[PDB]
């Protein structure tokens, strides 16, 4: 898999490929690895599918309950909850998660919880097998407070490369855009992104 989240001026965007493999067989070529845990808090999943689905399912539950009781939770709070599950169960999980969300006090925020359950807040984050191929490209091209249209491009290009090189990544590129405005899903197909 290849996944990333990027903060920009108006909020934050998450993107991902859409391939799931069991060895070389592509089990699913249209996976949704962008997963909602609250209206405006989403995550990117990598690692085991069972593990990351089951975790995301639980976080969503916790935040539904948080909300019922204390109102809307901070992106940070959501990252705390993921981390607590991942840290406390490191011995039998294989999950690498990027959390991202938007509120008005803080605009976009991105937290990454790699294996082991450490948590790291960042301007952007990349992950999944495909990510190794684009550390160079991303460090070279990310700038803070990009526009939306710039940031969709930065993601589209980063992931087009991750895909090109990583056999465990491919398919369509999905994004989810998080701003004061609301929630926009995007999709880009092979004929667009291969050609870049």
């Amino acid at each position: 898999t290849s996944i990333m989240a990027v903060t920009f001026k108006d909020g934050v965007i998450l993107g991902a490929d859409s391939r799931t493999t069991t060895g070389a067989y592509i089990a699913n070529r249209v996976t949704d690895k962008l997963t909602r845990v609250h209206d405006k808090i989403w995550c990117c999943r990598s690692g085991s599918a069972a593990d990351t689905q089951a975790i995301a399912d639980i976080v969503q539950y916790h935040l539904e309950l948080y909300t019922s009781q204390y109102g809307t939770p901070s992106t940070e709070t959501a990252a705390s909850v993921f981390k607590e599950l991942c840290y406390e169960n490191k011995d039998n999980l294989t999950a690498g998660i990027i959390v991202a969300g938007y509120d008005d006090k803080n605009k976009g925020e991105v937290y990454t919880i790699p294996l082991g359950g450490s948590v790291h807040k960042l301007p952007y984050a990349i992950a999944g097998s495909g990510s190794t191929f684009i550390y160079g490209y991303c460090d070279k091209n990310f700038r803070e407070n990009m526009s939306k249209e710039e940031t969709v491009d930065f993601i589209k290009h980063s992931l087009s490369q991750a895909i090109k090189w990583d056999g465990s990544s491919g398919g369509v590129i999905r994004m989810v855009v998080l701003t004061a405005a609301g929630v926009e899903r995007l999709i880009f197909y092979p004929d667009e992104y291969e050609q870049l």
Binding site: D91, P114, L115, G116, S118
Partner: protein, 233 residues
């Protein structure tokens, strides 16, 4: 934790006439990927203690949280939290060494090596080490990881014994430590140019310095190294 994932390298430290100094680079590595650059591994506790941590970062972050909460609990029903009954280094250390030995003894270690540096309310320097096995010791110098191998040798040239601690100023101690960081930068493949350094002085108190860089490096000579044996150009 049964096997460390994101990791911090050497912490180094020494004590000088009036306090202690301690330092550590700002890197979290992921095997040989140098992944996270903005990582503070010096953790100040009150105004008389800095805890420096290496090894697994998820565990470090757990230990941070225990330290926050020790500070919070010591304040409870404690009119003298900011005075005679604040936390000493010696207390924070005993607590950590307890926890480590306990976690080891349940075969589920905190995969770290820690150095607690501070100045005791009675003026005394404190410098002790504990790690994932619960092993502890003190010395005028202390370092984890590579630092044990390269930094101690250099810092011991300054304080070879107890009797030298009074003689060692904070300018000398600090310059020694900075030089060590440069040496480790040269030779530890898991290290970073950027680091943090902290001083705990029984008169100036806690000075914490973020964002240092190794400077005054020598590489020029590298231009005359050609081949590996017999090549001349």
């Amino acid at each position: 934790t049964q096997q460390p994932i994101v990791t911090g390298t050497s912490v180094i430290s020494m004590k000088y006439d009036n306090g202690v100094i301690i330092a550590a680079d700002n890197l979290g590595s992921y095997g040989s990927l140098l992944r996270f650059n903005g990582v503070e591994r010096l953790i100040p506790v009150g105004d008389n203690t800095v805890v420096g941590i290496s090894g697994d970062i998820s565990d470090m972050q757990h230990i941070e949280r225990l330290l926050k909460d020790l500070v919070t609990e010591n304040a409870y029903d404690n009119p003298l939290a900011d005075a005679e009954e604040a936390l000493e280094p010696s207390y924070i250390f005993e607590y950590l060494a307890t926890v480590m030995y306990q976690r080891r003894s349940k075969m589920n270690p905190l995969w770290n090596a820690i150095i607690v540096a501070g100045v005791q309310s009675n003026g005394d320097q404190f410098l002790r080490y504990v790690n994932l096995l619960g092993v502890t010791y003190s010395s005028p110098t202390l370092a984890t990881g590579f630092g044990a191998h390269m930094a101690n040798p250099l810092l011991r040239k300054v304080v070879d014994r107890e009797s030298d601690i009074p003689k060692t100023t904070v300018q000398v101690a600090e310059e020694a430590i900075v030089n060590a960081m440069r040496v480790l930068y040269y030779r530890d493949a898991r290290s970073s140019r950027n680091f943090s350094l902290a001083i705990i002085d029984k008169n100036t108190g806690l000075t914490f310095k973020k964002n240092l860089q190794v400077e005054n490096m020598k590489w020029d000579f590298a231009k005359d190294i050609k081949g590996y044996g017999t090549q001349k150009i």
